Amino acid sequence: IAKSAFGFYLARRGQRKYPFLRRPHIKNTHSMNPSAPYFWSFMTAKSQMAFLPEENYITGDWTGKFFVSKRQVYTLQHATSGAKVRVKSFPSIFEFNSPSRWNIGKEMNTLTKPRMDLIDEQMLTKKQRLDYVRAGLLP
Amino acid sequence: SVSGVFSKGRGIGHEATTSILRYIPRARVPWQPSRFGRENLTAADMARLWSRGRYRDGPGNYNSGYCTERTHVLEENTVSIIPRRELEKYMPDITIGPKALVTPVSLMNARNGHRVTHDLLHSYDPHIGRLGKPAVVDHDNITVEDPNRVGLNAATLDCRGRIYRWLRRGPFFQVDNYFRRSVKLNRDGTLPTDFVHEAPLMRKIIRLAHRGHLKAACEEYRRVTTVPPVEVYRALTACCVPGAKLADAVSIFEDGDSKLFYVSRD
Amino acid sequence: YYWSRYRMPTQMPKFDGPAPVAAPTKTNEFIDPIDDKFPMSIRGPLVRPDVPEDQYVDSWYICTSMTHHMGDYRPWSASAPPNAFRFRP
Amino acid sequence: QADRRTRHHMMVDGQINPREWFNWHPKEYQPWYFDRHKFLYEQRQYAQFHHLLC
Amino acid sequence: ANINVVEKKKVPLVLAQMDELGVPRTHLSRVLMDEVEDSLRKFQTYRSRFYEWGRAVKQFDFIEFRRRNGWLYDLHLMKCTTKQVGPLRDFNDPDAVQGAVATAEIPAFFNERPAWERPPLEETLYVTTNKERYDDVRGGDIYYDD
Amino acid sequence: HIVSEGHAMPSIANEIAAFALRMAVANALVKLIPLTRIPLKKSGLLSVDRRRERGQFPGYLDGKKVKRRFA
Amino acid sequence: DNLQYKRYDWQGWYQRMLDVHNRNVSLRCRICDLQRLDGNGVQFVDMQTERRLRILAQHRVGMGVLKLDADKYEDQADNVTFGTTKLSELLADARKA
Amino acid sequence: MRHIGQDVPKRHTHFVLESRLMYEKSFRDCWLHSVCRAISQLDEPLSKTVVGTHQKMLQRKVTCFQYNQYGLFKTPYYRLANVDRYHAVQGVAGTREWVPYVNVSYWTMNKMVRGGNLLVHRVHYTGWGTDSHLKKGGWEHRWNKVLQRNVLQYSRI
Amino acid sequence: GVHRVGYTHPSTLPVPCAQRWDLRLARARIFQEYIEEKAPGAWQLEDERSMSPEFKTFTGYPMRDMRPGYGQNLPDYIMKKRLPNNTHYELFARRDIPNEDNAMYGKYLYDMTVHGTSLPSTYRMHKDINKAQRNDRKLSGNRFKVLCSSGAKNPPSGWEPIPD
Amino acid sequence: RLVEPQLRPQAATDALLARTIAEEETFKLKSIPHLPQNAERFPHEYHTPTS
Amino acid sequence: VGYTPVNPDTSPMVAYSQYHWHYNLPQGMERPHSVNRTFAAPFQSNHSLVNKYRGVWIEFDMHPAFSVALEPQLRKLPRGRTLPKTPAEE
Amino acid sequence: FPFQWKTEDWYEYEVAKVRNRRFVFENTEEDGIRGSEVTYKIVLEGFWDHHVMKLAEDVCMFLKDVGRQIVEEKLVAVRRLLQGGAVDPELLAAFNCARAGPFGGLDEYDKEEVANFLRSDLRRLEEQCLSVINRCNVPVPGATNIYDPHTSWPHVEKLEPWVRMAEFWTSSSDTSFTELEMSTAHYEFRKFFRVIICKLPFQSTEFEKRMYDIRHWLHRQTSCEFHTIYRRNVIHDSAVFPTEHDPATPTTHEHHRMFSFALDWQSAPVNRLSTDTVHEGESWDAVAQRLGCSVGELKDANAERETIEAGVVINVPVTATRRLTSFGATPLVLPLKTTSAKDGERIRTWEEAAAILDCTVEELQQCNGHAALTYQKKESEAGEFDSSVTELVAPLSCWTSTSESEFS
Amino acid sequence: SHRRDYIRMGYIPRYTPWEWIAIQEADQPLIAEQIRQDNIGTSYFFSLNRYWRYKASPHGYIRHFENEVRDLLQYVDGVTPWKQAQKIRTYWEVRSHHPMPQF
Amino acid sequence: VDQTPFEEDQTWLLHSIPVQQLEMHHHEKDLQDLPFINHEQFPRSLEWNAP
Amino acid sequence: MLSQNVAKTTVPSYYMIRTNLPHRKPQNQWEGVYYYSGITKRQRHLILL
RNA sequence: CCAUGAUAAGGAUUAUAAAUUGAAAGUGUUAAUAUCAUAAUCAAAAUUUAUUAUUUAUAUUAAAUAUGUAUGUGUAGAUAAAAUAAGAA
After folding, report:
1. According to its record, what are the GO cellular component terms (chain H) (predicted)?
2. What is the rounded CA–CA span in Å between residue L26 and residue L33?
3. Total H helices, total E strands in chain D
């Protein structure tokens, strides 16, 4: 059960059908979907000639960003500079402490797994743990 | 058991008029005798309230690039702000400054009365950005911090009425306000001419006119921001005699006299 | 007072003699009992006077048709030319 | 702090509180001009005699 | 109101036709020009000023001017009407009672009391003031005249 | 000659359209020759059937006549 | 508009919106209308000029009636000026025949 | 503020004003953003005047200017949430919880039609109404007819 | 098939005429058009759904262009797109606000003109009436919350609240 | 006539983007490539937003 | 009902109640109104007249011969809405 | 009969009929119902069909009366002209302004012929006015048919009402999507309009005044739109839109790419110089040959210069076929040589070049840039030209054009 | 105005009387731009340009803003430094350092 | 050099012709949000003419 | 003091919340917009002088 | 949190006839009880939750970014829908 302010304000109204590609809250759970032949044409800008998004650059006289935007595309300088790179994700943040050259040119949201396979055994309740065991997700 | 959102406030008029004006009762609003607006806030409180107006890309938001806190607690997990120097290493620095935000007058009409790209809508009338001082909009000092409370935001105090007033603007509202607050006639009776910045354009127009390039002369005339002098109009009118362009001469005379303070009444 | 306009009261109609006695399926208020009970072979399958639909307008907020010229029903021959075959123009 | 002359209670000392914005007939709020410096019979007191002024 | 004042609306048409014909405007006498300018200021609003004459501040300033001059008998916002006129009991069939189906703001000289059943001139002899009862009306004339 | 009005489709090779053509031809023949009306009326050629396809309704699963799943 | 959006702050911008919506200025001119004698003694437009004009204006002409819908400016006064200018330009380019 | 002497019954009604302001910002920025986007990613030469380096350098500079434009209204219209102006209830366009003509939610529409607050006419629930275009082709046909009435009717100059 | 389109000059022709490409260039001079060089010659498709009278949705105009890759980012779309200025969005962003009375005119100005002073909203009146009706019976439930606590914490010299 | 009169002289555009020419001369911009060395090997791979 | 008011111009129930005109009844103007003719207010503008001279006028009018004769001297003296900046002692 | 047609012919007919919707010349000279000088369409819109029908009837009656009075005034005015009148010298000049009539020479229309043309026009206008008056008098309370033009004026036509069906949920459930969809309801907004068509054989501002002022007294909840189709005389002249030959170098597709409407094209018409400067080795015939005009017409255009002197500015005749275009395509280059006693070898400062070229220093910097980049200026208030500057180019504003460099 | 049996007796006129027509017509002024008189030719050169405050504004599609686009290009090229703008890269340039930049 | 519309059927489906994947965008109809959300600025007739 | 300035709005109460009575008069479409076309006394005196 | 009322879904007996196969008994948001309450989209986001028709084996990723998963004898239990331009006695 996701806990957020909008959860009380809005209502799911069951498994309602939305217009194609027009769900209100976008949750790209398929960003980390791997596809070798379609590596450059999945969750990425369609044209190779397009410039990098505005989110990859600093515009004004900034004082500092806690985390960079997900659409910011990983570049060589991200690994070469050896600086601190963080991306907001559940639960709190994901930090790039393993700079690799195999992710150059791909978006950080594509690199980061949205739906983490790991399940917390601590906050899980008795009934919820029983449900997970019945589903097979937990022993 | 007294609670207050703001623990200190300041008055509007200083100690030269209120001491005498206090003897005259003021008919305050019956159902709310005590009022406390944004122009009555202290400096720090007003700054921190105006920072929170913008949804994002503003000082109030914890991660917008303009924050000042050393650390931010996120989901019971502390995080440290990456400084600008460390960001610069892998984020290329592109920055023009206040000049990028502002747009030219000729593009103001296409941008629908807005010469500023700032995310707070700037209105040139002296009533929307109404702090204690009248609302005056700067052009080369536009910044995200915006020390002068001249912009319009939809989260600060006593903003609903200003939002309604902005939405009820008439046609040519901002354009008319800009014109009437920038091209006002001088008190001494002299026309608002002899502007130092606009002077070369007049000479260029005069040269093109005397060279008989009336089309290019008008194409450069439309770029004039202030009111051109009578020399421009007399040259443009005298250009139409060889070509018998009475239509264009009449149009020039109308644009000169009917609108711009009867400059072409010569 | 702007509400002084919404002040005029009305009066109920004046009845005579006793009250209409009912008959000594849920009793539906909308349906008129005796009129509906009356045979269709006599009363005809009509819910309105037989007048051209041009004179009838579908009302608002009421599930019935009303007439713009109230009670003044022009016959069919009024619209048609004099002595018209099948009321054709 | 709160006071009997600052709270909104409808009745004070058994009489209708005159300190409530909602405790006055709306015609009182209508704008009017001071007339104490005018003539004695031109003041608002002689409303029924105003039509007979010379 | 007098209906012949509409004839001044033709003046801008005549001025435009004079512009087309080449008749000078200034050659008119100044006495005539004063009234011509009056009719122009009454029936010659430009488009630029038409884009703004419909607002709130201007209408409420006109309301304030009317209040200051003491003439509010012909303003939609500031005039509330209390008098009502009841139905007529037709003698054809007095059993049926009549109910109102609409409401109109008739100027009250359409349906006046005929003179012969009226007190003499009803103006100087009697002074009538339409005030409001302070007691609970419970239904009736809230605004009654004395 | 037959002129199609209303909703036009590429191929109208269906029994409903054939019935419409039959009714149109019968009415034209009746208008042309008066005494032809009796056989056609007694055989039902001129009679019109008021049946029509149920209109769309998004509440239905398909939109016409099938409700949604119930538990 | 008189039903609503009048007499108050609505009217100021509603009138402008209506005028911008109705900025269109149609200009119609028959092809046979132009087929007269010019002041120089030659016919203004001949069959060849008409054919060239028809080729130049694919859909702007129809049933021998050239039509141009000037929609460039909000003001009809400026839109008619633009329409006349474009019509004269098209006619001049068609007169090459 | 902080629910001290609130005048409006619902706090969320101010989000309607915020949405109107964001629409006005879109009105301001819709031309500049579109022009910058068009210039930035046009590979073909613009004209004889600008070709090669004179064009690519200009594209880079205009893209830099667009990025430096602080507060530009990037967000599209379909991703902006629609909130009723009467009861501050959110509805998403394209579903049945929002009506396009009245710009109010399904609940507000039902309340207003059930009371007397909006002059509407009743039609059959499982039909195509009374409009000829809706009977003919439906939603897409009436949409195309609106397009034809607006733009395709005019022989543009 | 694949071919190179030739262009025979009228001067080189046995008898000169006006070439169709020359006339089209004149047309582009007249009306400022765009000649898409990369437009293929094999993709000229007619929208038969809306261009053929066979279908019930026939309208006579090419309502849509048959191009699956036609999106919105491309400058071809951008150039011929319609700006939202003065449109139904312009109408909605101004007419649709919570208070239609405030849309028509300022509430404070309207009250100061027709009435005496500014009148509070019905909700505020409800709050004031409930407070009036509940303070008479008891004075324990209420508390003191104000925007500016400075005046309450430092009352003027001659402020003595009446004991109750 | 040599050229069409309605055409615009290139000096107008030069005066328009005068700063661009000066900056190009200062920074010695010989050429700005837009494709890699062997982009022509794979035609469907790149597909610039004009084709 | 409720805190939110009901606008009578948009609400058809108020417009079709017994206190207004029903749609079945004929739609026609009733009691034509003349407000701008019975008592017309003078034009008082909140903003000052923008085209006002805003100065003292001297009504300079001399014989044309003398004016053209003194034209070389009068160029330094102020003209209509034109003020040369010549030194006053000159 | 029976009809059998080709599919392509059917398709072409249908699409042509659909497209040719507004291609109708409403105002013609044909005699009868069709044929008028101005046309007015009052599209009156309301909520109810009977509302708009009754409003259309009322407005039709009002317009019938007003138009009858206007047309009768026009008739009693035109019968005076038909009885007798005079032709103005302006009209005579208009009729005799042609250089060559259809008969190959100058035509001399006299008073009698001009009056005959005027009288024919007045007769046609009178017959149209009489037709309008008769159609206005035709309607009667016994039988009033306003939906046909023959028996009514102005005749009233119909228009398809705007009907919009809004489909929305009615349930307030926040869980059951099936229930929400099954609770769907349809309610539609309707706007009914009626169109009133008036065809006046003349343009009168009085009728427009009486027509635009009916929105004040329109019925309840009804608006109106005024479509106006009026004949207007437009002037086409070769002075500003000439018919010249195609350029020697034809424009290609490269000049019509994207953004070419602004990058390399200016708004028509392109300016052509109407003034010229005469050289020393010239005469009246020489300048006439240079400008491609008659010497007599050039002399008449000048109208004040009996003699031609070297370095004199004259006015180019408006009908000249070789009029120069402003800002000729040949760039102007300022030579480095002083051609004076200032330095004797090269221009030193930029102010000197600005004075020579009569242009601003900022424009001089912008035109080339190279001099600004390589400017060998000392920071101690000393600016000098770079020794590597091969040439100095003049700004576009100072360019000049000549026939030799502008014509092939 | 002499109709005593008005409203009360069910009399509502079908046609608005001439007196009321004249009253309503005389109450409001006439727009001076509705005369649309024209005597001189169109101004090809100066009418479109005019003055910025009352400039003839193109509306709608971007292609109609030819002058506005020209001014925007001039402003952006005169404000944005190339040294700052050169730092913008392209996707192919960035991906050229990938171990598999092209397949 | 350019091609002509293919005479044969096989090349039409064997050529590199993609298919629609995302939402369909029209140069003008994008103002009207969807066929269901038909945004009409004014309640004018669908058969209305502008002369 | 003026006898025409009366109470347009009712005394505050719960009827304004619990009843559907509108709080303002619906707009009168036939009554025209108020515009300024008058002459002041000093202006008339100056004209006569 | 609580802080009165109000619209939904739910077919079993008034039928042919010049006719409609969707109900009033109530569904989150709406008008009197108070007494720390700043929880609200303007993008790029976090399945554990009853109430939801998905494309099945010739040709398969181009424009806002848009689904990598489960081939297994049309296969247990349990369960859904339709007698209206369709074809059922």
Report:
1. kinetoplast; mitochondrial small ribosomal subunit; mitochondrion
2. 11
3. 0, 2
- Chains F and L share 3 or more Cβ pairs within 8 Å: yes
Distance CA B106, CA M53 (A): 9
Ordered strands of the G61-62 beta sheet: G25-30, G65-70, G61-62
B/e letters for H46-61, b = 16+ CB within 10 Å, e = fewer, are bbbbbeeebbbbbbbb
Beta strand pairing call for H90-91 and H82-83: antiparallel
| E35 phi-psi bin (left φ>0, alpha ψ -120 to 50, beta other) | alpha
**L68 CB-near residues (< 8 Å, 6+ apart):** L133, L136, L137
Q: Give the residue from L54, L38, L47, L342 showing the smallest Cα distance to L198.
A: L38
Cα E47 from Cα G15, distance rounded (Å): 10
What DSSP state is assigned to residue H125?
T
Q: At E9, phi and psi to the nearest 5?
A: -65, -20
Q: Give the N- to C-terminal CA distance of chain L in Å, as an integer.
A: 64
CB N46 within 8 A of CB H149: yes
Binding residues of B: 187
Tokens for D12, please give them. Answer: 């004070």
User: Are G42 and H130 in contact, with CB atoms under 8 Å apart?
Assistant: no
K12 interface with H at CB cutoff 8 Å: yes
* For M100, nearest residue in chain A (alpha carbons): A102
Does chain I touch chain E (at least 3 C-beta pairs within 8 Å)? yes
CA distance L58 to C15: 43
Å between I41 CA and P62 C1'? Answer: 18
Sign of CA pseudo-dihedral A113, A115, A117, A121: positive
Q: Which nucleotides of P are covered by protein (CB under 7 A)?
A: 6-10, 14, 17-20, 22, 27-54, 59, 61-69, 79-87
Smallest Cα–C1' distance to nucleotide P18: which residue has it?
C45
Q: Cα dihedral sign for B83, B87, B88, B89?
A: positive
Six token digits for residue A20: 């194609």
Residues 53-112 of chain H sitting with CB below 7 angstroms of strand P: 73-81, 83, 87-90, 105, 107, 110-111
How deeply is K60 buried, as exposed, middle or buried, from its count of CB atoms within 10 A (0-12, 13-18, 19+)?
exposed
Experimental method: cryo-EM
Query: What is the nearest CA distance from L260 to chain I, expressed in angstroms?
Result: 8
Q: CB-based contact (8 Å) between I86 and chain M?
A: yes
Interface E–M counts its CB contacts (< 8 A) at: 57
Enumerate chain E positions whose Cβ falls within 8 A of a Cβ in D.
67, 127, 129
How many residue pairs bridge chain I and chain K with CB atoms within 8 Å of each other? 10
Q: Least CB-CB distance to H154: which of G62, G71, G82?
A: G71
DSSP code of residue G69: E
Residues 6+ apart with CB under 8 A from L16: none
**K4 beta carbon to strand P: under 7 Å:** yes
CA–CA distance, I105 with G6 (Å, rounded to integer):
12
Type of residue at A103: N
From residue L326, alpha-carbon distances to H49, J8, L368, L395, M66 in Å are 19, 11, 21, 14, 21
Whether any strand P atom is under 7 angstroms from the Cβ of A46: the reply reads yes
Please name the residue that has the structure tokens 């005030």: E131
A67 CB neighbours strand P below 7 A: no
Beta strands in chain H (DSSP E): 82-83, 90-91, 121-122
Unique residue bearing structure tokens 């919106």: G17
- How far apart are the C-alpha atoms of H61 and H50, rounded to whole Å? 14
- Chain L residues with beta carbon closer than 8 angstroms to that of B215: 266, 270-271, 326
Q: List the B100 CA – P51 C1' distance (angstroms).
A: 55
Resolution of the structure, angstroms: 3.7
Q: How far apart are CA O28 and CA K8, in angstroms?
A: 12
Can you tell me the distance from the alpha carbon of K31 to that of M12, in angstroms, rounded to the nearest whole number? 12
Contacts of G47 (CB under 8 A, 6+ apart): none
